[PDB]
């Protein structure tokens, strides 16, 4: 409905007790002008979990499309039973770092000229459908860093445990 | 268009201090972190730390914690690097370099300031030196002691010049670079490949990891003429 919960608060690590220097960091997959973070495989429970998977999307060129895939609860039995995505209203709402904690923010207020198509393949542009996309504008004047969380770290299969996925989108100035 | 201009050469006695400046023109100063990188004569590149100019926040590695202080003046888009208690092994050329996405790569470099004092991920490059000829295809290897995914960049440096960035993200060709250059690798092992050596590809080539702090450089693949 586009409203932000001003009281909501979280952290990159969540409850995993993993510190930022131990994250499994990795770049997005950048094909022409679509940058993708696919969490299908990265979040399945394993013996070594909980791990933090941090998919880093870095943009400094015009009209890039960002697509984030977060596997749905029950899309495969057992694997994603306890998965949670934050913010619920992504991509309209994102998270940003304010005084060392992650808080909700409107993406359109953060980057002027943002295109959000209401529908992705005739489906709602929302994580409840397993994917979100947006398109960055032709010109950006302010560096900007915002986050998505696709946390499967509360799913357990015996001694196997799912992972917490982070998307860090880092927009730099461009278009001059 | 983007420019970073630094103070002149300094001559110091051991026990003194040195302030080096980096004026920025051509872009919005506050939107890009500024790092410092030094180079002893005939040696490799050593990262010194970064300042965020919106906030003044610094980040240093243990080698320079308490040795060096980074300040900035947003009034005039300038950054200062003060190094205290100078000793002879501090003789070197000090570069300010503008970070892209904080520290992903260093597209833009200053001209360097020579300071002349009187009297942890390892990057591994092979070969150390080589000789070749126009038209030859040359392959250089770089090797990380840890998985760094694609957080790897390649730089060309000519004598008396700041490093040019040629490749970032392991295999992205920087704008304005001859397409004879290419990069490959993901994880621990990387290759820089020049399809046809042209007369001004004769230089020293460096790889550099941006995965985790401190930022470290390979020690240099020098590419000579016969």
Q: Where are the domains of chain B?
A: 3-117, 123-225
Residues with Cβ within 8 Å of A31's Cβ and at least 6 positions away in sequence, in order, are none
Instruction: Assess B151–A contact: CB distance below 8 Å, yes or no.
Output: yes
Tokens of A138: 């032709």
**If we measure between CA atoms, which residue out of B204, B99, B206, B193 comes closest to residue B153?**
B206
Distance, CA of A138 to CA of A63 (rounded, Å): 5
Closest alpha carbon to A135 in A159, A108, A101: A108
Please give the full DSSP string across B49-89, using - where no structure is assigned.
EEE-TTT--EE--TTTTTTEEEEEEGGGTEEEEEE-S--GG
How far apart CA B141 and CA B121 sit, in angstroms, is 16
User: Cβ(B224)–Cβ(B130) under 8 Å?
Assistant: yes
Cβ distance A136 to A69 under 8 Å?
no
- Residue A106 in domain: yes
**Cα–Cα dist B3/B162, whole Å:** 13
CATH of the domain at A129: 2.60.40.2860
The edge-to-edge listing of strands for the beta sheet with B78-83 is B3-6, B18-25, B78-83, B68-73
Are A143 and B31 an interchain contact pair (Cβ–Cβ within 8 Å)?
yes
Q: Which two tokens stand for residue A2?
A: 């586009």
> CB distance A27–B28 less than 8 Å?
no
**What is the sign of the dihedral through the CA atoms of A36, A40, A43 and A48?**
negative
Edge-to-edge order in the sheet of strand A65-69: A29-31, A34-38, A65-69, A131-135
Angstrom distance (rounded) from CA A103 to CA A94: 8
Residue contact A173–B28, C-beta within 8 A: yes
Nearest CA to A36 out of A9, A13, A68, A6 is that of A68
Of A21, A26, A141, the CB nearest to B28: A141
Cβ-proximal residues to A48 (8 Å cutoff; 6+ apart), any chain: none
Decide if A42 is inside a domain. yes
CATH of B123-225 given 3.40.190.10, 2.60.40.10, 3.30.70.3150, 1.10.3080.10: 2.60.40.10
**Size of chain B in residues:** 226
Instruction: Say whether B123-225 and B3-117 share the same fold.
Output: yes
- DSSP letter, residue A115: B
Breaks (C-N over 2.5 A) in chain A follow: none
Domain count, chain A: 1
**Closest chain B CA to residue A27:** B150
In a domain, A176, yes or no: no
Question: What single string gives the DSSP state of each residue in B142-156?
Answer: EEESS--TT-EEEEE
Nearest CB to B31; choose among A21, A30, A142: A142
* Residue A4 maps to a domain: no
Q: Provide the pairing of β-strand A24-27 with B221-225.
A: unpaired
Name the experiment that determined this structure. X-ray
Nearest-Cα residue of chain A relative to residue B214: A21
| Cβ-contact B152, B185 below 8 angstroms | yes
- DSSP assignment of A138-175: S-B-S-EEEEEEEE-TT-EETTEE--EEEEEEEEPPB-
What does the alpha-carbon distance between residue B42 and residue A37 come to, in Å, rounded to a whole number? Answer: 42
- Contact B101/A25, CB-based, under 8 Å? no
Return the CATH number of the domain spanning residue range B3-117.
Answer: 2.60.40.10
Does any CB of chain B come closer than 8 Å to the CB of residue A139?
no
The count of other CB atoms within 10 Å of the CB of residue B209 is 23
Identify which of A56, A55, A64 has the alpha carbon closest to the alpha carbon of residue A31.
Answer: A64
The structure tokens listed for B28 are 């919005």
Owning domain of residue A75: 24-171
**b/e sequence B167-177, b meaning 16+ C-beta within 10 Å:** bbbbbebbeee
C-alpha B72 chain-centroid distance: 20
SS3 A109: helix
For A72, the 3-state DSSP assignment is coil
> For chains A and B, what is the number of CB pairs under 8 angstroms?
32
Q: Does B100 contact A141 at a Cβ distance shorter than 8 Å?
A: no
Interatomic CA distance for residues B1 and B19, integer angstroms: 26
Backbone angles phi, psi at B166, to 5 degrees: -105, -40
């Amino acid at each position: 409905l586009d409203k932000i919960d001003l009281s909501y608060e979280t952290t990159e690590s969540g409850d995993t007790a993993v510190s930022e220097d131990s994250y499994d960091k990795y770049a997005s997959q950048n094909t022409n002008k679509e940058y993708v973070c696919d969490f299908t495989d990265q979040l399945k429970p394993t013996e070594s979990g909980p791990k933090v998977k941090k998919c880093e999307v870095k943009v400094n060129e015009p009209l890039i499309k960002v697509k984030i895939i977060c596997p749905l609860k029950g899309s495969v039995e057992k694997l994603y039973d306890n998965i949670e995505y934050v913010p619920k209203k992504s991509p309209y709402v994102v998270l940003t770092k304010e005084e060392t904690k992650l808080k909700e923010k409107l993406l359109s207020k953060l980057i002027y000229g943002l295109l959000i198509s209401p529908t992705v393949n005739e489906k709602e542009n929302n994580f409840k459908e397993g994917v979100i996309e947006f398109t960055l504008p032709p010109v950006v004047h302010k560096a900007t860093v915002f986050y998505f969380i696709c946390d499967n770290s509360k799913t357990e299969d015996d001694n196997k445990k799912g992972n917490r996925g982070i998307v860090e989108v880092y927009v730099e100035p461009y278009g001059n | 268009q983007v420019q970073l201009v630094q103070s002149g050469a300094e001559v110091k006695k051991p026990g003194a201090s040195v302030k080096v400046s980096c004026k920025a023109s051509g872009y919005t100063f506050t939107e890009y972190y500024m790092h410092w990188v030094r180079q002893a004569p005939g040696q490799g590149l050593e990262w010194m730390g970064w300042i965020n100019p919106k906030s003044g926040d610094t980040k240093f590695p243990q080698r320079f914690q308490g040795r060096v202080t980074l300040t900035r003046d947003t009034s005039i888009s300038t950054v200062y690097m003060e190094l205290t208690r100078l000793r002879s092994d501090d003789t070197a050329v000090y570069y300010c370099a503008r970070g892209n996405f904080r520290d992903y790569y260093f597209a833009s470099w200053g001209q360097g300031t020579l300071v002349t004092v009187s009297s942890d991920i390892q990057m591994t490059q092979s070969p150390s030196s080589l000789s070749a000829s126009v038209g030859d295809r040359v392959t250089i290897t770089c090797r990380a002691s840890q998985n760094i995914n694609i957080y790897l960049n390649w730089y060309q440096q000519k004598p008396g010049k700041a490093p040019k960035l040629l490749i970032y993200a392991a295999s992205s060709l920087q704008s304005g670079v001859p397409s004879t250059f290419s990069g490959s690798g993901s994880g621990t092992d990387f290759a820089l490949t020049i399809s046809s050596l042209q007369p001004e590809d004769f230089a020293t080539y460096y790889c550099q990891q941006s995965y985790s702090s401190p930022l470290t450089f390979g020690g240099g693949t020098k590419v000579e003429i016969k």
